[PDB]
Amino acid sequence: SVRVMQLTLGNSTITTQEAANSVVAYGRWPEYIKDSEANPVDQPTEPDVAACRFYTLDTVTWRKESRGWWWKLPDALKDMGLFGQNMFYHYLGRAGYTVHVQCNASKFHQGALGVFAVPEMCLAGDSTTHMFTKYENANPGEKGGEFKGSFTLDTNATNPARNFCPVDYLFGSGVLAGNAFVYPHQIINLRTNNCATLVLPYVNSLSIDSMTKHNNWGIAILPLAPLDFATESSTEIPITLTIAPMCCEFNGLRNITVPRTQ
Amino acid sequence: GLPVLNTPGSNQYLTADNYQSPCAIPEFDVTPPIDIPGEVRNMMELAEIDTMIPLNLTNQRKNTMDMYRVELNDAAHSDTPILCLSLSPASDPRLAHTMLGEILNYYTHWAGSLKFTFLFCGSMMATGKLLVSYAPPGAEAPKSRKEAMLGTHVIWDIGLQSSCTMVVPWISNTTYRQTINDSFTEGGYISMFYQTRVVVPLSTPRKMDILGFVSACNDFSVRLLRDTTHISQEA
Amino acid sequence: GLPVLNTPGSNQYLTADNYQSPCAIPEFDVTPPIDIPGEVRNMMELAEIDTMIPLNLTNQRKNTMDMYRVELNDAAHSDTPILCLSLSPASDPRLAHTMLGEILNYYTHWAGSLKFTFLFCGSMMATGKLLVSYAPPGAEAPKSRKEAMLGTHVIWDIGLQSSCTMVVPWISNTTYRQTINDSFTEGGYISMFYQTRVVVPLSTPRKMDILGFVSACNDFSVRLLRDTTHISQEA
Amino acid sequence: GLPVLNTPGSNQYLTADNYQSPCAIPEFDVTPPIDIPGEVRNMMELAEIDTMIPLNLTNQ
Amino acid sequence: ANNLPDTQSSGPAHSKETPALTAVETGATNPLVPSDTVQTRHVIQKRTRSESTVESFFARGACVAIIEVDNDSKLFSVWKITYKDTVQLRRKLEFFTYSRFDMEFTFVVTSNYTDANNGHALNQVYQIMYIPPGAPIPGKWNDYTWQTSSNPSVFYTYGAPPARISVPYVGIANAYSHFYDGFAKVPLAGQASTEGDSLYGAASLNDFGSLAVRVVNDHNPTKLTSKIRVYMKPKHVRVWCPRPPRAVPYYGPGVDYKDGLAPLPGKGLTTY
Amino acid sequence: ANNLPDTQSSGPAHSKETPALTAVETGATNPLVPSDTVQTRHVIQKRTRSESTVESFFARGACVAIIEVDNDSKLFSVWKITYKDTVQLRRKLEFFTYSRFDMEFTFVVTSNYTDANNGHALNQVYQIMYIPPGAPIPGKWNDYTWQTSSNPSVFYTYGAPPARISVPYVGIANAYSHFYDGFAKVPLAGQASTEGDSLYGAASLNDFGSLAVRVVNDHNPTKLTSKIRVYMKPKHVRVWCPRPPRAVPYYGPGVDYKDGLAPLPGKGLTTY
Amino acid sequence: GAQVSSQKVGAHENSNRAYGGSTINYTTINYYRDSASNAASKQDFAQDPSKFTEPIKDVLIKTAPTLN
Amino acid sequence: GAQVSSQKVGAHENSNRAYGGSTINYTTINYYRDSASNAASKQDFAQDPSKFTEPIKDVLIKTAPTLN
Amino acid sequence: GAQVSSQKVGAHENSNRAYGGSTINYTTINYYRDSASNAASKQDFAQDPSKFTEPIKDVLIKTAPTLN
Ligand SMILES: COc1ccc(OCc2ccc(COc3c(Cl)cccc3Cl)cc2)c(Cl)c1
Numbered sequence A: 001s002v003r004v005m006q007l008t009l010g011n012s013t014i015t016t017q018e019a020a021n022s023v024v025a026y027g028r029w030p031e032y033i034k035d036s037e038a039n040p041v042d043q044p045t046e047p048d049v050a051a052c053r054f055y056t057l058d059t060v061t062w063r064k065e066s067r068g069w070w071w072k073l074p075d076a077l078k079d080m081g082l083f084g085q086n087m088f089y090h091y092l093g094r095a096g097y098t099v100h101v102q103c104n105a106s107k108f109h110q111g112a113l114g115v116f117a118v119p120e121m122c123l124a125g126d127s128t129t130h131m132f133t134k135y136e137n138a139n140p141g142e143k144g145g146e147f148k149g150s151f152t153l154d155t156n157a158t159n160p161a162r163n164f165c166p167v168d169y170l171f172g173s174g175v176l177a178g179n180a181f182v183y184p185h186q187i188i189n190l191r192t193n194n195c196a197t198l199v200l201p202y203v204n205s206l207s208i209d210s211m212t213k214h215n216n217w218g219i220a221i222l223p224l225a226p227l228d229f230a231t232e233s234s235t236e237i238p239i240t241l242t243i244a245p246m247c248c249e250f251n252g253l254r255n256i257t258v259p260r261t262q
Numbered sequence B, C: 001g002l003p004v005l006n007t008p009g010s011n012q013y014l015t016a017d018n019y020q021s022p023c024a025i026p027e028f029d030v031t032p033p034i035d036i037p038g039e040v041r042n043m044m045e046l047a048e049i050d051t052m053i054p055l056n057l058t059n060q061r062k063n064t065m066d067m068y069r070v071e072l073n074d075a076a077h078s079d080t081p082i083l084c085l086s087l088s089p090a091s092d093p094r095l096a097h098t099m100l101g102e103i104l105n106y107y108t109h110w111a112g113s114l115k116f117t118f119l120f121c122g123s124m125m126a127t128g129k130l131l132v133s134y135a136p137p138g139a140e141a142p143k144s145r146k147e148a149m150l151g152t153h154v155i156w157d158i159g160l161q162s163s164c165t166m167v168v169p170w171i172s173n174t175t176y177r178q179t180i181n182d183s184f185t186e187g188g189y190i191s192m193f194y195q196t197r198v199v200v201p202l203s204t205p206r207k208m209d210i211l212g213f214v215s216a217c218n219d220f221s222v223r224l225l226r227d228t229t230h231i232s233q234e235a
Numbered sequence D: 001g002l003p004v005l006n007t008p009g010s011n012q013y014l015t016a017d018n019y020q021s022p023c024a025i026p027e028f029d030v031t032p033p034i035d036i037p038g039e040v041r042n043m044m045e046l047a048e049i050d051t052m053i054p055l056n057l058t059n060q
Numbered sequence E, F: 001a002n003n004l005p006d007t008q009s010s011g012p013a014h015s016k017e018t019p020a021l022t023a024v025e026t027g028a029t030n031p032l033v034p035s036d037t038v039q040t041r042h043v044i045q046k047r048t049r050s051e052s053t054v055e056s057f058f059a060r061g062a063c064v065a066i067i068e069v070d071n072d073s074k075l076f077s078v079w080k081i082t083y084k085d086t087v088q089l090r091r092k093l094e095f096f097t098y099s100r101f102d103m104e105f106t107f108v109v110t111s112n113y114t115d116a117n118n119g120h121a122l123n124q125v126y127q128i129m130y131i132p133p134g135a136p137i138p139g140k141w142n143d144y145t146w147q148t149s150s151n152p153s154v155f156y157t158y159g160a161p162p163a164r165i166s167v168p169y170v171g172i173a174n175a176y177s178h179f180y181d182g183f184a185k186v187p188l189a190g191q192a193s194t195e196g197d198s199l200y201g202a203a204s205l206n207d208f209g210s211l212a213v214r215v216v217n218d219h220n221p222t223k224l225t226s227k228i229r230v231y232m233k234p235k236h237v238r239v240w241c242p243r244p245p246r247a248v249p250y251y252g253p254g255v256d257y258k259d260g261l262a263p264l265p266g267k268g269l270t271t272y
Numbered sequence G, H, I: 001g002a003q004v005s006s007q008k009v010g011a012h013e014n015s016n017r018a019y020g021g022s023t024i025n026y027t028t029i030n031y032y033r034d035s036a037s038n039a040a041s042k043q044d045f046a047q048d049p050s051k052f053t054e055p056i057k058d059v060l061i062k063t064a065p066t067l068n
């Protein structure tokens, strides 16, 4: 039925008994580069089962006060097994994804989470200096980031944070959040479903790019209807994020990249 | 040479003309296209996607995530409206900033049917019946369920299918309406009432939110491209 | 490029030209037409509809409803005219403001036949015979029935058919006449006389009105569009 | 004459245009060509010839 | 736009058919021709009604507005689009109740030094921007609105032949209404008198929007004034329901009158 | 750019099919039409979406720059090519993530005497030279760079109709990116913080090069200023991935915001 | 896409060209996509005035009595 | 090398030329070698919004229950 | 005397005219007698660089030893 599914990729399987169908972004399933759209001339590496499998990133907790969370792809998976290895050993890389967000509660809980997949999800910074966010802050990895309820300008001139300041109702980029529904999405309304499943093809203005310099997709999760339970002002339910890269192919092998951190 | 006669309009520059001109970079090897997902052919495609409506523009809620949440409760049945709206998709503050309203503000005329979808975000243990209504212009705006029920309406029963859609049919005198607040091309009123009441058992939240969405139907069209007031530039 | 040579008349603006120009609102979705009753194709269609003539322009009657009423009475037979008019449809004060005269004032030339219809508004008990006449220009304007009877005339017998039409045939030297008072293109005289007399029995009104109407025949045409003097604008 | 309408761009001089113009020396008897060795059709032909690289740019 | 019928010869009559007699009470006009009441000869008719067709009657550029700008807020002007600012075209259009056509607009631009012996300026360029009802109206001769990314603009260089553009049938109804016997609002029972009140005979508060005109050059202290005379010509014309023409002076956008109520002169009943 | 479907008549219903009920959690929009929830009549639809096609939406010349030159280094100016110097066209382009089109550039040139009663100059000729990233940039209004043996130049004579040229799709990628979630450099472990640092969302330091404008005439002591307004129109348009439009004021080339963060007005929940 | 119509010659020159041939025809070509840009053809038709001159239900003959 | 397309006539003149013939067609000829120099034809197609409106894996009918 | 060539369309409009018909062709006509007055056609051919890259008397294969 629309509600029961099983996803198998490599050596990993995911089962769900409360789905609300699955979304295939823009109606496009991920695919490899065709010869007619090929650019780099060298033989690509395609790890296949070693990289195209389900990786579970860290679990976040939803509370009445949560504003939202965000992650960047392939960034969030840079340290994930052999996918991360191939990402750092190659100059160029390409991949699609199957994003599976998990969140179960009970029949006496309420709340709705909007799960959006955004191509080129550029976020707003914290200073008066334009495009000032530094690489280390823009790429948090598997832990991702969070949305805020208001904009707060960083004034420390001696030691600028050079970080993002994504305000939730402004979708972290100066647009109204209610219009974010034009992007592939699903809603995890506690009275209806457990999860959200989105299949994302590779989207870019090029056939292949640098995975370290460029993040193709952004995953934004916003509480559309806040978490509430029985009478417990105190309520916490975890949100686990499991993502699997698809049709990975890398070009331009050399020595490994070791990016600067923190 | 060939005898010619210059007609009025010569040497002018019409910002909306469509002529040919010499290429400044001749014989340029243009990069071929690739099949990028999500291509768009018409702006109306975007107007047909559900976009969340900022229904709660009260002073404490406007410009926060709370402007999108309309709260309901398990109180005894009342005939007073849960919300009220005017069918002015491009000008009503609650509709003017949705994806639909944003596009309508780049055009002078609009025509067609619209649909409002409401999502119930209460717990699974909560039940209830609501009446969503649409009253064509010309009479007093409905203030009780009794008046609202006399116009176009959908009685929504809450359950498994979490959402309910009410189609606002194209009922107009003129062939196209204007994207500004104008009485001559006024559209009517949208309102919601409790049919019975929201009922929840013990150990369950007594207040919950509903979210509203708006999109255009397949018979919707706009015309006369104009500039929007939604973007400005000082100095 | 292609060698061209600019001829005199280039870059001018002829108010009556007929050229193409770029469209300022391209790809506009034009509202289709509906079949509205009463469409007009030619201005001459309007000139062929009977319009009431303001025959009585005396100081007390002009610019009142009385300017349209010409009164008759049961007096003994007289050879003096009931009314007199000049065939200058665009300039005679009595004809210049009828629908026919209004249209003629937007043109410089007119040609064709005209017809005058008179309606008897006396009681049913009233009887009488009248002589309506038309005298082509060139001789003395008729002042007695004896002179009028020598030209084109219709002897109207009053009865069941309340009205009578007299056709003023196109009798002209020039192929077209001017819409201004000019002797070279003068049209002649229209007059009415009592043939016998209006007779009424006792207990019946001895005075009654007749109304006149004027319209163009099917061989009527106008040419050379010009501006009318019937509308002005100060400052 | 034939009614025309001047479009924007008229009377300008685009350094990269490609139009016709009158010949200032009409009916000139042009010297015919001869088959000279080493003709070139494309600049890329020259880029495909090995050229020595100045690898040692040290001060001395 | 065609031919007229020939006159057929007609001889004497003595019959029971009387086309001269009629009854105008029916609401009809007696379709008589000369041969019905007099003896006629045969005339081969060559005159036509080619120039009185609805199209030829309106096929002239009429002035509808004179917009003025002083290049020393007057650095720019706004004209609410209408055909009622002038009287000549308005009176012709009002021979009919409804119309449907395309429009051709020609702009004649003139300028001059206010001072006979002072100031100087380089050739001026004008921008005529159409602001459809809803679009932002310029507050300054140089604010962001003049970017025209969507509004149609016409840039005219002084001295060039008059600018000219065509506009399609832009009505929101199936035809333009020259007369509207109604209101845009219906006052409801119970509401304050201030409520539900609107102008008689008015439709939208902003029917067709307006034109914003300005000189693009940087203004010099020199005293200069320019005037843009707008000429409009209806082309591809269709009209419905004829009406008697305006007899007394216009008094506003409505059918209101006040002043020249006695249009006809005096003339003796029996005076030729 | 076509037709809309007709409305089919629809009668009453009493069935197990309930199109009114749905579940938006799936991420889909309910494709209902009036006849799904009410009784409808048959209407033959004649309206079309001809003017809302991606092409017609952008088919307007929008101002992207106002370059100024003072013919008394200001004798020449350089403008780094971009669409972000203005807001109107930028906001429309940003409804999409990627685009691919040709460009038409029209140049409106105006000039004037700064002094109302002083100076005089003969008609000016302007040179608009395109300097592709890499070509030498002019240091003086008259140095060797203005020879343009390879760079495309446009020589405009003051008073002539606006100059206009077309540019092909010149991107180094298969489409123009309106948004780039990345950097041009990756800082490597071990290198100084000064190292490997670049702007967020920036690609090449010099994407499309710039325009160098100057007056070719020898400058006279007279005080004169000229302004070249650049208008650009995307033609032969294709766009990908729609995005919600900009709601708050722009704050630079990025998606940064700072000032008008509260765009919506107050309105009662139960107020019509 | 040229439209060739004939003119209604008023004043005739002492030529046979004034009476026949392409010399009494005129040529037209539309340059714009929008019909609004077009000029007026002026080959306009006429109609019956009856809707105004005789909007009578029961049709009557002029020779015959109107009031019957 | 002329391209002859037909116009979508909005307002119709009282002519038969407003309904047929080359009088409702427009002619086009490209003068430049580079396609960039060309004007926009504006004979643009539309498409299915489904990729945005219903990017669902398992296709669903509106009459049928969405959550099954 | 018109020469009709086809253009190499770079950016394609959402039209079928962008893919076929006279809409992707351009027309040319020479107005001057002297060929010098003509514009450049720009339909220019290429050639083998061998005269520069391999002006060798005894032809050699890259796989095979150059010095034999
Ligand atoms: C996504 O939106 C975009 C993408 C690219 C853009 O600019 C690319 C660009 C590249 C070169 C030139 C050079 O054009 C010119 C030439 Cl050859 C000669 C003379 C004048 C000009 Cl003006 C102009 C623009 C713009 Cl403005 C918007």
Ligand SMILES: COc1ccc(OCc2ccc(COc3c(Cl)cccc3Cl)cc2)c(Cl)c1
Pocket: C024, C025, E064, E081, E082, E083, E093, E099, E103, E105, E128, E129, E130, E152, E153, E154, E165, E167, E170, E176, E177, E178, E208, E211, E232
């Ligand atoms: C019944 O008689 C009528 C009906 C409508 C009329 O006006 C309608 C109308 C609507 C838009 C525009 C806008 O036209 C323009 C454009 Cl796009 C660009 C530049 C200049 C102009 Cl000018 C102009 C007129 C008039 Cl004047 C008479």
